[PDB]
Amino acid sequence: QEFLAAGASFNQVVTALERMMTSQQRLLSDISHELRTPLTRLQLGTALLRRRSGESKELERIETEAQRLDSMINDLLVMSRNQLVSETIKANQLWSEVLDNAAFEAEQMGKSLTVNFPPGPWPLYGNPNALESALENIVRNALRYSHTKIEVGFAVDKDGITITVDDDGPGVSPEDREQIFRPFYRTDEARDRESGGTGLGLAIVETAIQQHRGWVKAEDSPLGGLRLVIWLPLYK
Amino acid sequence: AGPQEFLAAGASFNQVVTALERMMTSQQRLLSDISHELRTPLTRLQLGTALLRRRSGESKELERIETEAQRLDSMINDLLVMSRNQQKNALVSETIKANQLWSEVLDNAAFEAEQMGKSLTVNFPPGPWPLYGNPNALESALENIVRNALRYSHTKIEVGFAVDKDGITITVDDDGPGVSPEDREQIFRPFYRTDEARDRESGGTGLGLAIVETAIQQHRGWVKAEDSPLGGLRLVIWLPLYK
Amino acid sequence: AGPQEFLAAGASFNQVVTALERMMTSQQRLLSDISHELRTPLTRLQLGTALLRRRSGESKELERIETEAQRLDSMINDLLVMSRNQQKNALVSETIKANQLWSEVLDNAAFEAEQMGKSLTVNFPPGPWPLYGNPNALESALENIVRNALRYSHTKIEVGFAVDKDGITITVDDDGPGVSPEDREQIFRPFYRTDEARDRESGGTGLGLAIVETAIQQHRGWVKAEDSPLGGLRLVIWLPLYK
Amino acid sequence: QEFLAAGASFNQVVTALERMMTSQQRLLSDISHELRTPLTRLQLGTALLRRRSGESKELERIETEAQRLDSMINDLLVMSRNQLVSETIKANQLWSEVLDNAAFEAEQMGKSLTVNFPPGPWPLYGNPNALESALENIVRNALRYSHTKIEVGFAVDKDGITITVDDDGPGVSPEDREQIFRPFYRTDEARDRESGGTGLGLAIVETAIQQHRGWVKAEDSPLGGLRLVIWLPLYK
Ligand SMILES: Nc1ncnc2c1ncn2[C@@H]1O[C@H](COP(=O)(O)OP(=O)(O)OP(=O)(O)O)[C@@H](O)[C@H]1O
Ligand SMILES: Nc1ncnc2c1ncn2[C@@H]1O[C@H](COP(=O)(O)OP(=O)(O)OP(=O)(O)O)[C@@H](O)[C@H]1O
Ligand SMILES: Nc1ncnc2c1ncn2[C@@H]1O[C@H](COP(=O)(O)OP(=O)(O)OP(=O)(O)O)[C@@H](O)[C@H]1O
Numbered sequence: 001q002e003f004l005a006a007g008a009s010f011n012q013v014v015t016a017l018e019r020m021m022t023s024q025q026r027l028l029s030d031i032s033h034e035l036r037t038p039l040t041r042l043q044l045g046t047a048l049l050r051r052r053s054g055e056s057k058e059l060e061r062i063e064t065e066a067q068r069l070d071s072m073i074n075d076l077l078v079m080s081r082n083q084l085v086s087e088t089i090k091a092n093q094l095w096s097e098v099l100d101n102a103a104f105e106a107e108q109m110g111k112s113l114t115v116n117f118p119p120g121p122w123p124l125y126g127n128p129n130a131l132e133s134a135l136e137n138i139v140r141n142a143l144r145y146s147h148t149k150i151e152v153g154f155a156v157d158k159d160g161i162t163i164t165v166d167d168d169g170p171g172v173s174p175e176d177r178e179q180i181f182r183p184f185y186r187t188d189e190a191r192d193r194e195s196g197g198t199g200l201g202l203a204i205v206e207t208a209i210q211q212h213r214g215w216v217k218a219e220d221s222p223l224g225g226l227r228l229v230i231w232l233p234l235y236k
Numbered sequence: 237a238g239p240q241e242f243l244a245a246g247a248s249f250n251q252v253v254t255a256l257e258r259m260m261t262s263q264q265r266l267l268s269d270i271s272h273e274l275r276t277p278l279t280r281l282q283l284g285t286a287l288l289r290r291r292s293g294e295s296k297e298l299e300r301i302e303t304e305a306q307r308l309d310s311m312i313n314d315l316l317v318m319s320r321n322q323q324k325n326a327l328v329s330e331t332i333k334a335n336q337l338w339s340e341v342l343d344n345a346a347f348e349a350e351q352m353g354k355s356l357t358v359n360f361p362p363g364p365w366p367l368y369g370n371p372n373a374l375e376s377a378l379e380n381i382v383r384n385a386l387r388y389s390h391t392k393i394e395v396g397f398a399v400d401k402d403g404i405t406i407t408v409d410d411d412g413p414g415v416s417p418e419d420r421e422q423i424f425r426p427f428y429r430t431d432e433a434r435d436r437e438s439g440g441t442g443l444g445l446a447i448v449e450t451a452i453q454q455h456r457g458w459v460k461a462e463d464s465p466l467g468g469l470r471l472v473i474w475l476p477l478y479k
Numbered sequence: 480a481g482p483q484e485f486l487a488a489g490a491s492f493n494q495v496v497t498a499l500e501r502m503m504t505s506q507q508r509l510l511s512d513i514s515h516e517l518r519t520p521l522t523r524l525q526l527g528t529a530l531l532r533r534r535s536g537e538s539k540e541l542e543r544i545e546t547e548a549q550r551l552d553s554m555i556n557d558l559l560v561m562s563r564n565q566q567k568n569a570l571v572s573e574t575i576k577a578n579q580l581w582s583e584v585l586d587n588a589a590f591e592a593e594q595m596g597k598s599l600t601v602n603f604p605p606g607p608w609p610l611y612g613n614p615n616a617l618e619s620a621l622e623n624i625v626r627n628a629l630r631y632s633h634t635k636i637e638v639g640f641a642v643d644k645d646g647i648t649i650t651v652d653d654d655g656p657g658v659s660p661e662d663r664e665q666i667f668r669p670f671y672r673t674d675e676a677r678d679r680e681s682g683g684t685g686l687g688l689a690i691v692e693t694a695i696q697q698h699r700g701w702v703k704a705e706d707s708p709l710g711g712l713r714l715v716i717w718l719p720l721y722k
Numbered sequence: 723q724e725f726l727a728a729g730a731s732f733n734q735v736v737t738a739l740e741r742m743m744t745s746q747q748r749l750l751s752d753i754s755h756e757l758r759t760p761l762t763r764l765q766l767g768t769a770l771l772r773r774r775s776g777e778s779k780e781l782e783r784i785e786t787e788a789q790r791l792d793s794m795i796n797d798l799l800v801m802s803r804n805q806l807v808s809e810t811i812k813a814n815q816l817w818s819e820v821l822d823n824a825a826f827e828a829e830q831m832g833k834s835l836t837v838n839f840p841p842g843p844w845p846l847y848g849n850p851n852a853l854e855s856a857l858e859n860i861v862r863n864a865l866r867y868s869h870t871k872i873e874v875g876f877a878v879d880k881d882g883i884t885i886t887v888d889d890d891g892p893g894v895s896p897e898d899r900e901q902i903f904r905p906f907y908r909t910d911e912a913r914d915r916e917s918g919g920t921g922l923g924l925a926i927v928e929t930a931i932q933q934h935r936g937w938v939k940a941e942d943s944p945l946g947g948l949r950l951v952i953w954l955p956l957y958k
């Protein structure tokens with residue numbers, strides 16, 4: 001009872017702490033509830049379109065990118081009140097969809113996205129969501145900060161998978177190349193760029209790969225821009 | 237581990253709170269990471285509507301999809317800003333006296349009010365009263381109550397401090413329009429906006445007062461929203477004394 | 480699959496609703512199964528407190544544990560009853576006319592009121608108006624509004640029907656005590672009880688009005704809780720006409 | 723737009739359906755939120771006890787049976803907004819804790835609970851929670867409806883696991899023995915018994931075992947009461 005002032009009832013301290021310790025969980029839990037309802041509307045609209053104009057490749061795209069949003073809103077409502085989760089996955093199962101999307105988006109950008117070698121049925125053990133996010137972020141970094149080409153190659157051996165993403169955009173100067181995995185950081189060249197956005201991307205990448213005992217590098221790219229290499233280990 | 241567990245172990249007051257501060261920065265990251273990752277499929281969804289347009293043309297349905305998407309777009313952007321600020325200055329509770337805590341805040345409401353041709357009256361000023369918490373957080377919590385009262389007031393704002401053995405009670409009042417007794421309930425919810433500020437719009441995240449409630453509850457105090465005698469909105473913050 | 484998807488496919492009105500009815504009986508089972516399985520660890524927890532007692536004796540802490548456990552115990556029991564009823568008569572929407580739907584309900588409020596030495600006045604009676612939904616559910620939704628108004632009234636109850644092209648609007652009023660403008664918001668929440676019925680107690684699950692809101696929203700209508708002119712609580716139910 | 727009356731705005735039908743279809747999810751989601759907060763209090767009380775009276779076997783029991791409650795409340799808040807989930811598990815991992823608890827509770831009842839043969843590291847694939855619930859229910863049925871003894875035996879072969887639970891309570895007449903797996907059903911003898919409770923137990927058992935391609939029987943028990951046999955299949 002060292003927590004409120006010197007004379008509060010026992011019921012008073014009980015409730016005082018209960019508010020104190022559930023406050024961020026409830027904020028997230030409510031932020032979660034609030035994102036859900038406009039998405040739910042957005043989904044009813046697509047339903048009502050499919051009822052009228054019927055099936056459509058564009059529609060199906062909206063229809064599923066909706067579903068991705070619905071899933072992640074459900075992740076917030078989970079891990080808010082929880083405060084780690086892992087399972088076994090094959091690499092093709094893991095990242096194929098990430099790459100197919102990278103393709104659809106690269107085409108909309110009018111940019112060439114090539115996958116030199118694709119992920120095989122290679123054993124990983126970890127968090128599916130985290131690893132997808134790791135790959136998607138360095139790929140879409142490359143999609144954006146590139147001029148025209150984007151290249152992605154997978155490599156496997158007894159020890160594990162090595163993903164290599166290349167672009168022909170501007171490089172990242174050697175000095176900046178270390179600090180770009182730190183949160184909210186952007187190269188001086190990029191905040192000057194008309195591109196805007198939080199420096200969170202590569203920071204999410206580093207913490208997902210480091211939590212799977214892997215590593216990430218930023219390097220010179222044979223394509224002229226920036227090379228990003230992920231390395232994860234296989235599972236026994 | 238859980239700050240509740242530190243409490244269960246027998247750790248000091250200070251340890252239990254830094255444990256909480258820890259769990260918070262975690263939940264704070266979880267928030268700003270998920271926010272970051274909702275933009276990805278959103279961008280793709282809006283690539284899709286864009287292509288649906290160039291094909292089947294305008295639609296009552298398409299228009300709904302696109303505006304709920306832009307709403308999601310806006311909230312996520314509001315959300316990233318918020319936790320970027322929260323994770324800018326660090327979470328460090330400490331002992332601090334109420335007049336040190338809020339004097340400079342109030343002297344600015346003073347000035348901001350004079351710039352606006354409105355009056356600010358501090359009925360009773362804060363005294364040298366011991367609080368324990370996050371000085372950036374507490375500072376900011378009051379500045380926002382008051383900067384709001386300045387905005388939504390018609391002419392005058394009144395800030396009032398009260399101390400007793402159990403703790404400090406801050407009361408802020410404006411002579412602007414009220415808040416309907418039903419919206420007085422839900423103004424501390426995230427993204428909530430009474431339809432009136434929603435009529436004027438001029439932006440507005442709906443997050444600020446939700447931050448305040450979460451922040452105060454984390455200091456073991458509370459907040460209420462009442463009818464003000466001045467006509468408009470009364471906000472009350474209570475916080476416990478420290479020893 | 481999801482009734483939303485049936486809607487997306489192009490299925491009839493009737494099919495979309497029986498799809499919903501399906502998802503409901505599922506969620507209903509999920510509810511009554513989880514309820515059943517929370518009793519297990521609760522029983523064990525209360526085996527534990529019982530043993531803690533016989534050891535270290537009474538405690539402010541132990542007393543808290545035991546009363547929050549008995550609260551959980553009570554809610555789970557309230558919850559099992561509820562979904563047992565919901566899963567007793569089946570979920571079958573159908574077309575039904577408003578006077579067929581509610582006449583017998585009202586003729587009973589009449590009688591129950593006369594037994595209680597209170598008056599019930601049906602300002603405008605329900606007409607032969609087409610509704611589509613669950614007759615057990617709709618029946619029950621009104622009986623509960625009215626049986627409540629009988630209970631919490633001081634002397635008189637007033638039921639009023641209104642029809643127009645868009646649908647039926649039922650209004651129930653009692654001259655009992657009100658419901659504070661803040662609790663008017665949260666009375667449709669599960670387990671909610673204004674502190675006044677919580678003072679008298681005499682049991683009370685806090686579920687009934689939550690059932691009504693969920694039930695009406697499922698019929699595409701709505702419910703509001705307003706100040707009654709009669710003094711007490713006004714409830715309003717709107718429902719759409721069918722064609 | 724066949725759903726409200728003949729002249730409602732498009733925004734009106736959108737919201738009308740959105741309420742209609744999220745109504746049970748939100749009821750559950752809220753019923754979930756409401757159970758959480760008294761549990762949260764109950765947990766703060768135990769924390770405050772461990773802070774004062776310190777560690778205690780009774781306390782630790784309350785402390786973890788709390789945690790079981792917290793987990794299941796989080797399951798409601800999940801599967802409300804979702805509308806199936808399965809993974810691989812070993813049988814000892816699966817049901818050991820269920821049995822240890824059956825023991826602690828049998829001791830409080832002053833009844834003998836014996837496990838003739840225990841679950842081994844035997845491969846199953848399904849829902850962990852569901853299968854635990856299946857075993858726990860027939861065991862605790864036996865704990866209760868018994869006079870003194872309760873027996874539990876596991877058996878494995880190439881095809882799968884066979885769990886056999888025995889009690890020396892009153893039997894279940896052959897006729898009632900089929901219908902007792904139907905929901906809300908109780909033998910005429912049991913509603914007469916001072917025992918009270920919803921006839922949901924065995925119904926939860928049958929749907930969990932049938933959803934894993936298994937089966938359940940109620941039979942005469944060598945112990946004099948009722949025998950309950952579960953059979954599940956192994957995993958490839
Ligand atoms: N493929 C690339 N080519 C050139 N520069 C890059 C590349 N990837 C990352 N960078 C540099 O690293 C910085 C930070 O990257 P990070 O993904 O962490 O944040 P961001 O991309 O700026 O914003 P967001 O996270 O919202 O996408 C960028 O500002 C950019 O200057
Ligand atoms: N002093 C006030 N008087 C009347 N209404 C208010 C007052 N302050 C806030 N409100 C109402 O409650 C809403 C929620 O306030 P809150 O501070 O939570 O969000 P906001 O001010 O809209 O957004 P932000 O402060 O993040 O830009 C406000 O937009 C306004 O609608
Ligand atoms: N006619 C009324 N007048 C005033 N207050 C009411 C009235 N009806 C309900 N309330 C208040 O709102 C609370 C919630 O009502 P609700 O019907 O949801 O639950 P309940 O009546 O307590 O429980 P149950 O009906 O399941 O036994 C009531 O207990 C009471 O506190």
Ligand SMILES: Nc1ncnc2c1ncn2[C@@H]1O[C@H](COP(=O)(O)OP(=O)(O)OP(=O)(O)O)[C@@H](O)[C@H]1O
Pocket residue numbers: 859863864867868889891892893894902903907908909911912913918919920921922923924925947948
């Ligand atoms: N081991 C047993 N011995 C005797 N009768 C049993 C046994 N197990 C089940 N029964 C009979 O089957 C009936 C239904 O069982 P079920 O578990 O489905 O519900 P319940 O045990 O009555 O209630 P609850 O589900 O709340 O525990 C019981 O009423 C009882 O008569």
Ligand SMILES: [Mg+2]
Pocket residue numbers: 137138140141201202
């Ligand atoms: Mg990025």
Ligand SMILES: [Mg+2]
Pocket residue numbers: 380381384444445
């Ligand atoms: Mg604000």
Ligand SMILES: [Mg+2]
Pocket residue numbers: 623624627687688
């Ligand atoms: Mg009721």
Ligand SMILES: [Mg+2]
Pocket residue numbers: 859860862863923924
């Ligand atoms: Mg049972």
